[PDB]
Subunit: 120 residues, 5 copies
């Protein structure tokens, strides 16, 4: 796996506006909400020792809390459908947080593009 | 278990105004206290490596101290009746701290609702 | 053992004004000193991996530095007679730091009484 | 091995202006980019538990985020050729981050020289 | 061993002005440089998992970075002759950082004395 895999998805120039932290199944997690330009919302959660993105929990937590504090526009890298518990998915999101980057514009950010390739 | 189980409880739009840290039975703990606009006070404590909610000690301490620092209104998610040493319950609370969220209003905050079914 | 056991002692309305960190017998420790309201000093140290209060070293370090930084009046919970190495006691203190609270007045602070 | 080995290489007097974090092959990593006075560019990544430089990840993350926050000119010590996965290299860099220093001028910084001898 | 042993040595009333981080032999370390005024310099380094004083690495890193940020005068407690890799000693120092204290004047600071009898 890699944050920069050509897969869904990323949102660029996002301001992290909300922060939640809890626990489920003996595992700490946090979820962020951010807004793009345009006033639409992306959510993504990281869970400690989860499946495949669990090893980035500590780094992601510290980084996300940092960017929440600065109010800087950032790129959120996410993977859909990772969380499966239905009440959790309804309240929060199925998206795993898989990475973050600083941005130079609302659309140009540092790091790889996590995006599906196009078909010609 | 889950922070957003349909169980008591949560208080929304709370400013965290008091903070205490200590140790009991070889484990550090912290406790926070806050009031709503309604003047409704809530305390809850988190213990390191405790039975049910100890996995969250480290995140919740970080988050709580962060929110105590900004003074922003937040959601406190708690579970009553967790701590049982009577002198502890008497000076502090039986409430375990089980989650926190930022809020957009005094009633609406980011995160699940934690409340007994209707 | 608990921060709130009916034992000596706590001081309330203390501003943490001094901070020291080092190592003895392969264990990091820190010490803090503060004053008020009268103006009598209180010192207390927390040492990692000691027998009794060692488990709270990293939480108290964090919290103590935080309160050193804000300069707010706090409550210091201590247990005298814990450190026994004589040159350490002479330089610093026998008091173990055992807990910390925010205060609403010079006498009223959040959390238990620790008092005989 | 040592940050101050007489190897390639170091960039002095750079402001850290970009920061990325992610995961690859079960390991968190971060990358930074900095620009010099003269406009010239350096990138470098540190990955947890990976390479001979894995042991420095937490210290380097902390110190890199600190310097990103102050915006002061610093020295980036790096080792070219360490990351080999071609999509990672194309997107980011092959450079491992191997140390950091504060700077007194644009060429004078605190620490060892890391130059090929 | 103890920070406040009657041994070489301490410098009081130091402003920490430089900060370096790197790795040697699979261990992260940091080094600081301060000036007394007075006006002379001291350097000291702490290394994670180092033999005698490595238990202290994480607390000292945090504290030294804090005092670098505030720029307040502090006491550095050090032990000469700990680091022995000659290029390391040449570029940096042999001094191990073994403690830190806040100060009230350029010479009066909280904590033990560390000086030879």
């Amino acid at each position: 796996e890699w944050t920069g895999d050509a897969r869904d998805g990323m949102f660029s120039g996002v301001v992290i506006t909300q922060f939640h932290t809890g626990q489920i199944d003996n595992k700490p997690y946090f979820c962020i909400e951010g807004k793009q330009s345009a006033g639409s919302s992306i959510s993504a959660c990281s869970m400690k020792n989860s499946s495949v993105w669990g090893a980035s929990f500590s780094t992601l937590y510290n980084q996300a809390l940092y960017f929440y504090t600065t109010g800087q526009p950032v790129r959120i890298y996410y993977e859909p459908g990772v969380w499966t518990y239905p009440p959790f998915v309804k309240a929060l999101t199925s998206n795993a947080l898989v990475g973050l980057s600083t941005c130079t514009t609302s659309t140009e950010c540092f790091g790889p593009d996590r995006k599906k390739n196009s078909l010609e």
